[PDB]
Amino acid sequence: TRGTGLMSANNIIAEGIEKMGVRTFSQKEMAFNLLGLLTPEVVELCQKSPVMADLNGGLQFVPELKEFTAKLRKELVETSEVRKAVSIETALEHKVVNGNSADAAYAQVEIQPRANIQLDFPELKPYKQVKQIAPAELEGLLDLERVIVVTGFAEVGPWGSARTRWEMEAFGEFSLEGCVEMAWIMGFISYHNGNLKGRPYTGWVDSKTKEPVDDKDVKAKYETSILEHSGIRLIEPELFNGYNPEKKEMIQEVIVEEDLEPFEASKETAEQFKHQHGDKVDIFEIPETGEYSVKLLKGATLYIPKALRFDRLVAGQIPTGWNAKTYGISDDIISQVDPITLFVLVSVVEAFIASGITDPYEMYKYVHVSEVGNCSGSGMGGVSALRGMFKDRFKDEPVQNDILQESFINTMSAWVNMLLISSSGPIKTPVGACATSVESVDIGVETILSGKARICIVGGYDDFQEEGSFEFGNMKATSNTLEEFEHGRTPAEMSRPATTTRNGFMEAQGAGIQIIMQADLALKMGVPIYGIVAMAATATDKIGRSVPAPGKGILTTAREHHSSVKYASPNLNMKYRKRQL
């Protein structure tokens, strides 16, 4: 049998053997021979006595096969080596007669690709081509202030930006432009321009080693790193303030049964312990320092840190090394806000880019400051802040005084306005949990149809955090990663929608943002148009007692009365409407 190619099962000498009038088989041929042996006639045959099939192809009739195959291989080898030892002599003789100058004209210049990362605007066809797809009656039929078009989108998520995410979602692998962008996002390369080792240089360098990188190499050098630290993967404790779902810190209440070794506490701290425990603690000043001594007595109440083992070890996390500073956000902002608010700012700037609008003020050349809304929203809001006010205040850790503001779901919308837009438009933050981002688009449309805003920034955003993931795994809404390891599933293949073995959703983090405008406005500003928003609707289901149970509310977006469907309505005819206009 001839396995794969060249070396495998001595394929090179196979033709040699065939010369002797023996047949060697491809895998497909030899597979057809074996399947012959399961045809009814051979099966019923094999049921009577054993059957010895010989699919040898007559090779049994070649004498001393061993030494005869060895012989053939020897003649191919000695003919290949002789013709190599003659080609290498003729090469040397050429190189001695023509030197290094007539054999230098044969060396061509290779061009190596650079990454030319495009913004991927929609291609506009010539007017004849775009006039043919729509019905000829459409021209002058639509109110182009009532037509909501999407003008710009971005996201920040486990696979980077919309651009990279698409490449991964469509082609299961990055191009050159993808690999570069993902590298740049995850920090694996910065861009240098000036003196490097004194010598002037321009282009990418490694971020760690400050070594020149060329674009052709960035795939080879950092693909593995990128694929390993991107997407759905094992939770990293760096990205969540040392949260390890293996060792999830709890505390536990114990009644102290024997006095504690007296310890040092400042006056205030001691008096705090005295107000809490009352008689169960004894405080005494130490005259020398003025620092107090505290002693817990029998029957006091102490909190022993334990540690639990949670079974949701995997989650869709923004690529390791993602950093708002990269996109150009300042440290005074990064400190102040919840990481969610970074994902939103980066989504909004990158969505504007994609829309062609670099300086948002440009939008106020064409609209009044009261006409640019922000109908985006979140399901759960700034959960880093909420953890910083409920756990990290309770544990008297140093938390900023204005943590409450940062927690509030609308704050991310507000922070956009305060840094980028500086509008006075409608500000409607919807909370729809998983459906928020669609409730947002619904609000956005309605806000623009109402006339209150000509442009709205819609979308959703949610962070992922210890307390969420724990409470999702308690409800049994998420996948149980230890059950998936028993099933052999690697992380990458744990989100498997519509499959038989789906048991729970992978929880992820990040934002998505679209810019929606009236078509008329969009055409006037000359902003790209990635699609019309023909319809957006929400719908609650029905009377029940299970809040997370999804229903058939949205089915209502297809209601129509079919009692009188005998003669098609003249209303559904475009010529009729156009005439009546």
Place this chain on the structure above:
Amino acid sequence: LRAAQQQWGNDFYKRDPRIAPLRGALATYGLTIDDLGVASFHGTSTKANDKNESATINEMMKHLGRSEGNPVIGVFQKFLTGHPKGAAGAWMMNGALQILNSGIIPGNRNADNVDKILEQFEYVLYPSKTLKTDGVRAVSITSFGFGQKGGQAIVVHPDYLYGAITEDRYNEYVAKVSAREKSAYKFFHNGMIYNKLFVSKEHAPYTDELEEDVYLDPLARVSKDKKSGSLTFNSKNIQSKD
């Protein structure tokens, strides 16, 4: 005129109970129900949601009498990203737009074996590999949240808008885009190599003297300041009779 265009071109179905708000919103741009090629599914990968979603969409298409053997192509984006709760739709929408302006319908690459129950849903196809079609015309984004939150949104290929305008206005637009696309491309690469895509505004476009003046004048716009080189409200373009 606009209200006249509205009554016939845009909102011809908002009273008629023989036209489904889905049917209408496709019919506006002279598309039949058979033109909704792709449905972007919530597809969380949980027992309950995925069967109830598929049943819903299958029943919409079956009521609206979408032709037998013309199933929507389901795209389950969440095999790759995972489910980011509130941002889920906003990813799916981005995915829908990318599908429209590419003709490429991605494939659920983790769809090892589609659940046998989903067979009963004729109008839903569950592809396991990317299909390069000759064009999508419309995409249905459907989400289902906690607390009976249930959304849908249709998104129609932008080329059905250009139908609506004249050759001259089209040509003006195409010019103005091709120019902006170039400026944006410039600003993007500059930003990316010098870490300055994000530039926080230090000032409102209006000074605190003009704040109220600008709010109260509906036709107040920003004009290129000659000195600063930014866009700011000038005191001669607020309550301006011109």
Place this chain on the structure above:
Amino acid sequence: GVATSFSRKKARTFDSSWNWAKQSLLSLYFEIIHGVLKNVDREVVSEAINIMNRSNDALIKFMEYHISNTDETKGENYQLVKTLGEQLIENCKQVLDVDPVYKDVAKPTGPKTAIDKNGNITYSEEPREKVRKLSQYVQEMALGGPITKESALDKDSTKEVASLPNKSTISKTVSST
């Protein structure tokens, strides 16, 4: 070596052919319209088998739509796929309620060792001159050799597709030869 690998919980099932049919038609249909596949390629005939073997009503309806709504004016490709579609619908209607058949239609290949002037050895799977079909492969295997003695494919696939369900009666056996 003798570490236990097997467990019941790691069994992966695959039984959703009813779904993969429709994808496999839709891929073929777009491969042809973009011109990745041509009317001469054997790969078309393979896909037809792999579709006919998966035929049911639900598939036939899905073809009937996707083909009858193809606008043959839009290029030579669209007339090609519309002709091949109608054929493929007729074939699937015939073999509905017939058993699924393992039929190979690939090109039988023979080894080919080339040594160049420089002495580099290249192996290739060259299509055999005599045998071009499995039906001819059998006949070659029947006749043996001198040592064993003791004392429409590649030209028009659309036609070859038509002839898939039509069970060809063996007039005289290859055993007799």
Place this chain on the structure above:
Amino acid sequence: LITGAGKGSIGAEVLQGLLQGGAKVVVTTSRFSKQVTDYYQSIYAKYGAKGSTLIVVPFNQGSKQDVEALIEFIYDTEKNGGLGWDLDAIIPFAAIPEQGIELEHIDSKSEFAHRIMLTNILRMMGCVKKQKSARGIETRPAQVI
């Protein structure tokens, strides 16, 4: 059942044919991984004909416990987490390559190989005999190729 049907093997082409022919096939893999399940899904989505099932299970033929557990898994009723199948054919192509190992070099590796390519074949045949005689199945013998 079919062991040793790795990618680029005779097995693989046998498997292709069987699926294409509506056979319900239990293939085994030594190196069970994402890449292998993704390949087998591709195969079945290409070829796998109506009323054809493909079960991919990890399995180390060189273990006696794994052979017994597999055969129990095929024959156990679905209710007991099995398949509840009566094998019609067994195709044990599972092997490990040995090269340059003459008589004097026979060691661990060669003895293990022998146990995969002989002994455990005899154990599978055994275990199939014991599950078919347990349920009094007499008229459905399992063709072994």
Place this chain on the structure above:
Amino acid sequence: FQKPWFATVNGQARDLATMTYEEVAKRLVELMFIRSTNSWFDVTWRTFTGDFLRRVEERFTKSKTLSLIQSYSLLDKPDEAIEKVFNAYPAAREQFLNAQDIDHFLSMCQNPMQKPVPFVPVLDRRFE
């Protein structure tokens, strides 16, 4: 002045960032090549224009290909060499210079082993 402002196209003041790759290459040939004598004023100026064309090819090629400009001697007919390079890569006729290809152009402008360029390519510290 004897060193014009480089980023001019048809007497209109622009910048490097607002010029296409074509418009740059033409403006190099306009200022650094001589029509009357039909020959590059310098040798290092021919080299500088080649190094810019091979950068273009690098920026718009999709895979490892063989440069159309194998030797800079082919630039001794410049307008044909431009036409030939921008016919292989017709995208570079409409796209503006990448911010990387602006920084590489200005790093070439301050090459010490070449006759200075006859134009002011930027207003910054080094304008003097």
